[PDB]
Write a protein that binds this ligand. Structure first.
Ligand SMILES: [Cu+2]
Ligand SMILES: [Cu+2]
Ligand SMILES: [Cu+2]
Ligand SMILES: [Cu+2]
Ligand SMILES: [Cu+2]
Ligand SMILES: [Cu+2]
Ligand SMILES: [Cu+2]
Ligand SMILES: [Cu+2]
Lengths: 419, 419, 424, 421
């Protein structure tokens, strides 16, 4: 146990009384609205989102990085830190690794995971930066690089990622690359894409029967003129070309200004190519901010699309949900804890939507009541539900408060040497 | 007189009275546990007012088309009768903003009708973005900044007339928003056009009463699609500072570039005593003029957070003029203004809930997480019970839109007005 | 029949010839030193055409106001007389794109007038983004994707009629742009609306002749302000791939989110054989519909770089249905369309000056600098002489707008057409 | 000379022939337009833009940095490289320094500068990162940080920048900071700005009589929610508040999407607060790409505003221009050479605008001809002018070609050690 059980216990008790009042008040209110709060809590307590191994360390920009105390020394420290997130929120049972950063004996990763009660989610390849000994630089691209040998080196790396995942329990490989151009003319848009498709078809051949290959679009950064996998359109073209095992990943902050992201999710779902969602928030570009911190309503509107799919009865729909954020000015663990919470919060509120009444207002083109029906769920403070979900599953009524009372950060700060 | 039968208001309130009591008392207990007297909040909420635009009472359209609904108001007097409903039910819109020449009519009567309907008059709005019957000089290439002196003078005189009308009805401010700008590079000399504008505004200011305010309103684009004289708050500040003490800036939420941090702009203007007021509405792409809070409710709360904080910091003489400037193209105008007016009170109430002492503490300790969390604990709070109670205690409706539909008002005026 | 007197054209041409010969020869010498035969370029520029929107010759406005000029066309016939001017002076707009119901008239008359004016007819444009007098079902909440069956059916019926009118006048394609969408979250169900849109389009598709094409057009917003059924090229692609071989995509320059790489979209649609055509104009903030190349000439160039590159290589069946789609709110519509068309030919001609072999080499060497410099060398070249000589050789004007003004055509029709009032 | 003279001469002779042709042909066409090409060329060869000392190294992103061969390390390697740019384009006689990156003995800086034929431009302070052994961290800000000792440290540092500047010939201090917040509520907009203004006031006091203090706005990055100096509005309020010696810097890529940047330049000039413009290009955000490589017409429209002012010599308008770019996929030197070229190209084209005619069209509201009057100058290929200007002033006809012919890059790669190769 990363966090002393007696600490969690003391902290949960101190708030039990206040929780009981708010929850029961919310229960009565929901009952008046025809909603059984227990059924909502039952679903919330089982909603999981993956945590990125690389999100537990302090992030930075190209201008600087301001690390905090007790920064994780390697993958094992990161897993230890992810264990804290899961223990307190019970919403992040799985960890998503990034190779080569997390490269290590699979036997040992698995054992650490099992020992911590953590599982492993989608693997993540890295051909957007050069590693030591690398025979070919990824400066001008990787999977779509004009140099065949360079593309072969990227393919092999993705295949290795799969092998590693096969040994630890992972069932998918996420592929995000920087490939693109910074100057008009530097790249032949069409040929660069074909090279990419060619390299991806090879990675696809290495997929086990029950694995999936996720391609992730991004409007820009690191490329500032054009990007091979720039949007969901090109993303869909990829998944449809590769095969049943290939699907699209939608990362919130990877879209052009004012883009209607919730629609893209719907479109993808409609054609069964929504492989998963990468949560975070933003205001300007791919800011990778804590989910819900900037536009909480948009987060709820993304989930509205997710829940409506289930309501419509879409078949074999098990999206892979992962958090992909950067924490440049907060305790990484704390931001992940509250981000995971916002996600559960948006999900919970989406469950509160009266689809029946909604279905009616849409039919009569009653735009105002349709929107109001959505707002009634969104405006509901579901915090009590989230808190109760944690209590029942061994988590903390107030995760961050409990995290701070345990003095965890100071503990690891004294154990881990800064570099 | 009452546009909506008082027996309907009473009935539709008694039908919801029980539930409201339950919700209000629960919220009251919850705030008490948070050191907040719910009565202090309600008291301030029922005191918050925002003016309604006479032109918003009718159905709006785009350059592509206009799809009017039944019972469209024939003129200013019909529009006042519908504004009376908005006010009667929400009790948050005691004043109406007139637009000239659209609502030009015997001021003496307007006043009479206003007092009869329990309405007052807010800022006057001038119109030099369109030509009027008989007008001698077209505003096609501008108005106040037009290159032709005779044209600028005509625009000036029109604004002075606007002040004359407004003085007769009890108005205390003139709002100037023009489309002046260019659609082609080189079409206008930026500096000279602005100098022409300043000179004209100076003349209008000259004829402004000493108990009146002159509000200039910036906008990035439309109808001008390359450049706009008063394109942003920076230029707007220059205008206000230049003109004088009685001149201030008006911030319209949808008149800003993509991803602009509007709350910041609001704070800056307050700091330099130039925040004259607001034009509330929501948007996702451009100046969509959608119902407030329909797209980004958190942003609305943040704008209000700055207003409430300005008071907490001891800023003096701060009395912003709040106005709704929206276009309702696919809903009953009256129902939209009702809920928009409501969303604005909602954002105000949640902002009043912020624990400034605590927030201040986390800002000083650079505890970004708890700082944002402190803001969220207010925003997540469902303040609908306070809004409904406020309305109930002041002659309004627990559920405005519900009461509006139950009254059959729309069908009524549809039978009284042409098709 | 000549809308603009031949003597005036001849007069205004002879007045600039001396200067043109100098500039043309100087450029040719330069191009020659660059291993380029100027005559080969002029020959292709002469053959490049872009359709003119019948509604483009009338003064446009915004939701705030409309300030009409003098001599506004009363209907399709006046509009055709105005387009004839554009074609006579620029020689780059031989075909007009009609819009129903606005241009609803006897197909026999339309054709006769076009023939007499030396104009052909391009893609038909349907209208379900506004209600017509005597229309049974409003399009307020949608048309092809509307929740009410009768309303969709009515929309379907209308598009089929446009195909009929088109077959009679010589058209070979139907362009579909609708405002269908929502202004509020919840108002629409993204999936069910789209499904309805697909079903309806599948019907219109059945009424397409064997040599006709159906073009769907995406737009991020306006008139819908929260979500649009056909919001981007992604959805558009799904539409075209679902409908069939005769269904392609139209890319309207200003119908994209801020900072979108539009030229890549072109390339993407080309790569998958779904680039129905391009709708030119320029913009800075949104769907501004400004004169092409007036704001970002280089982007226009880059878009053509993709068009020419695709053309350069094995042109599968590549024959995009290009059309200008602009709104002229502060200029004489004819002069804007005249210069917009010239601008389009400018980007095209410069795209033809690109050293493809050299570009290909730098691309494979990942020589980003030289790659973008190779492109700039073409773009920087001032091709006005080629454009000017092209018009002259084909009975066009060396200085289109100058000739237009010198002819007095505007004052003329202004004297022949009823006055218009400004929209308040 | 970083580049041998025989190489420059040889590469110019090889292109002299065709240049005479193009130049003469352009001189004729301009003559027919009432424009004397010599007047234009004389002004172009005098148009300079400061080069950033950090612009010669390979740039990177938060995801990666892929250095090329012969990477300059330290202000001395850097100055050696900047000299290449100056010798070949003759458009960048001065270099802008960044402290602590280029911190070195002033005497040695002045020495190397005079030897390479380079002067020094505005000083650039750095409080958007922590230096080794720094008492207070700038994680949560610097000049507007909530902690007093932190602001004091930031102020003191900037003053240090002024001192270093007074000893090498610099006459200005540019101040761009990352200060802002990433979460609503994290910072109090007004109090953060007040602390900033109060700190800038202290720096301002340390300015000599002939020195200028430039503030630089930026919409976002590294702050992803709010930035204290987010736009020119706040910037103007800063310059106005600090005094006569304080002006605003406009960095092309530091604006919200679709912003009309040329208008901002005009407004600032009309009010005497435009301290200078930092050149680069962008398509998405602050991409810091090569000037005019994405939107050359926009670059021209900005210069159209600068040239209009330069013609009527506006009071308080003596801009300090500098290139501020990041080269991630090209040879920094080649990219800087060409960016400086694009900057001049735009300048030259703006100088071709018939101001009288334009003015007339604006008065009559003839938008078509007005925009066409700008296009005529813009559509003019002025490469012949820029090339002759370089040739007359000791530069190279084709800068990048000459540079490549000199094998300079390979040369410095042999002298400088790479991290691993
Ligand atoms: Cu990301
Ligand atoms: Cu991601
Ligand atoms: Cu507005
Ligand atoms: Cu407004
Ligand atoms: Cu359009
Ligand atoms: Cu179009
Ligand atoms: Cu800069
Ligand atoms: Cu920058």
């Amino acid at each position: 146990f990363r966090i002393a059980q007696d600490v969690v216990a003391r902290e949960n008790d101190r708030r039990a009384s206040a929780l009981k009042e708010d929850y029961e008040a919310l229960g009565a209110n929901l009952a008046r609205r025809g909603v059984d709060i227990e059924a909502v809590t039952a679903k919330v307590e089982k909603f999981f989102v993956a945590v990125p191994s690389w999100g537990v360390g302090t992030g930075g920009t190209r201008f600087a990085r301001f690390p905090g105390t007790g920064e994780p020394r390697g993958i094992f420290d990161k897993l230890d830190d992810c264990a804290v997130i899961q223990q307190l929120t019970r919403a992040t049972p799985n960890v998503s690794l990034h190779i080569p950063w997390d490269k290590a004996d699979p036997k040992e990763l698995k054992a650490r995971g099992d020992a911590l009660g953590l599982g492993f989610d989608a693997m993540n390849s890295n051909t957007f930066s050069d590693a030591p000994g690398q025979a070919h630089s990824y400066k001008y691209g990787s999977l779509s690089h004009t140099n065949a040998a360079t593309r072969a080196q990227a393919v092999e790396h993705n295949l290795e990622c799969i092998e590693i995942g096969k040994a630890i329990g992972s069932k998918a490989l996420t592929v995000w690359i920087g490939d693109g151009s910074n100057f008009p003319g530097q790249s032949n848009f069409t040929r660069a894409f074909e090279r990419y498709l060619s390299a991806m078809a090879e990675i696809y051949k290495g997929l086990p029967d029950d694995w999936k290959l996720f391609s992730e679009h991004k409007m820009y950064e690191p490329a500032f003129y054009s990007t091979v996998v720039q949007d969901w359109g090109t993303n869909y073209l990829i998944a449809q070309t590769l095969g049943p095992k290939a699907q699209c990943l939608v990362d919130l902050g990877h879209h052009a200004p004012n883009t209607n992201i919730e629609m893209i999710v719907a479109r993808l779902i409609q054609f069964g190519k929504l492989g998963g969602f990468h949560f975070n928030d933003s205001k300007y570009g791919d800011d990778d901010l804590d989910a819900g911190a900037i536009e909480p309503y948009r987060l709820f509107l993304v989930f509205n699309e997710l829940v409506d799919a289930e309501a419509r009865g879409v078949k074999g729909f098990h999206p892979a949900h992962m958090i992909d954020q950067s924490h440049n000015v907060t305790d990484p663990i704390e931001s992940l804890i509250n981000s995971a919470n916002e996600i559960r919060r948006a999900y919970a509120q989406a469950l509160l939507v009266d689809r029946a009444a909604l279905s009616g207002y849409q039919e009569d083109n009653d735009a105002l009541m349709a929107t109001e029906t959505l707002k009634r769920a969104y405006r509901t403070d579901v915090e009590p539900i989230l808190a109760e979900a944690r209590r029942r599953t061994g988590g903390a009524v107030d995760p961050v408060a409990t995290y701070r009372a345990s003095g965890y950060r100071a503990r690891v700060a004294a154990e881990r040497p800064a570099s």
